[PDB]
Symmetry: C2
Subunit: 233 residues, 2 copies
């Protein structure tokens, strides 16, 4: 019952985009997860043991041995709660509904939503070149995609506020379409005909990078929570 | 290479003093650690695989099966950096020196200081009766112990700021005297003739309690950082 957390969101804010975590190791830690890749070269998403790199060119590439990440989160997803949604529901209404059925706001959850969405809006981070800029700068020109009447899967994690800055507190969701070509990090969505599954997690295992970039990063950011809202909302 | 973290400091602040973590399980998770016991019935300290409950009655009781904790931290201590301190050094001077030799402020460390202390000041949290008050209120009358010219051991953890509220950011140290009777959570100390050892840790595993008390706790506390300074 664990979320395996690779590095911290505050390190990613500081422009630490080169990690040492080998994505070839994913099956040791989960069959489900999200994150990004070294150099912010695309969005990571996976479930049922199949992971993808989604880039702003509208392609999904399989995760391949040699791929590395500075920030990602995994779990072995088990469906502890299931809920059907058969009528239009906005993101706000959805968070309210899910929050109402969780056993506690103080635990970690993995969430999956499969089905038809009236709308999903995503962004996809793009490959950065050294010298790296802070992520609030990096995302300023991030590509934003609007999908209508789209079928696919949203996966992610629900993180309690005490963990903000390690992970993203609240709902952190990525999307991939039924065709497995397009999607990214989710900003907004409207559900139409979906099955929601939730997996409750009682442990969070944080793995720090053994890199000079992490060791030497200045992670004192008094405004980290606002910066996380800017980059992830 | 992990710190095993049982529950959060923010839940302790909120009066979640009854945990479900069985202290008999310690050997799975470390040979070294600090924290407290259910009901805040004493301070937990251990190293070299030997753990104690230090109570405000000036006794130390070995940990037994059936002992439970709402908050504690463990690791298998591996010396990575060892230094002799052979002259008087205040707490402030010590922290400055240790901070200057750490490879990164972004990692977790375990720390041990053994030897002769000119002074140590500790507190020992005391058993609370339900319904539980917040920790800032529960430590208002906390028992304080003062030690002078004492041999013993300080152990604990240095925690990066990004983990504050899960654990105590900065230095969190507990003490036990050579006689194994007395000590507690450290507020101040002056070294005299000591050896310091540090163990670097790259992983932190947070284990949450399976209790209604934790599940139902209101852990929104905008002022948690100040409250941790107050209690610790
Ligand atoms: Zn994301
Ligand atoms: Zn303490």
């Amino acid at each position: 019952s664990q979320i395996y957390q690779v590095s911290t969101m505050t390190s990613l804010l500081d422009g630490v985009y080169d990690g040492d975590f080998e994505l070839s190791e994913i099956p040791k830690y989960g069959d489900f997860g999200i994150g990004t890749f070294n150099k912010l070269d695309g969005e990571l998403i996976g479930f049922d043991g199949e992971f993808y790199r989604l880039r702003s060119d509208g392609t999904a590439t399989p995760v391949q041995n040699g791929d590395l990440s500075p920030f990602c989160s995994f779990t072995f997803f088990t469906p502890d709660m299931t809920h059907k949604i058969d009528a239009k529901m906005t993101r706000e209404e959805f968070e309210k509904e899910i929050n109402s059925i969780l056993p506690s706001k103080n635990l970690f959850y993995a969430i999956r939503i499969d089905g038809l969405f009236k709308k999903v809006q995503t962004r996809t981070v793009e490959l950065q070149e050294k010298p790296y800029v802070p992520m609030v700068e990096a995302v300023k020109t991030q590509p934003i995609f609007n999908f209508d009447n789209v079928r696919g899967t949203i996966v992610g994690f629900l993180t309690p506020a005490y963990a903000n800055g390690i992970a993203v507190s609240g709902y952190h969701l990525h999307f991939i379409d039924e065709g497995r070509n397009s999607g990214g990090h989710v900003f907004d969505y409207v559900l139409e005909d979906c099955t929601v599954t939730i997996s409750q997690k009682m442990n969070m295992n944080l793995r720090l990078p053994n890199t000079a970039d992490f060791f030497n990063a200045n992670l004192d950011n008094p405004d980290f929570a606002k910066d996380i809202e800017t980059t992830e909302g």
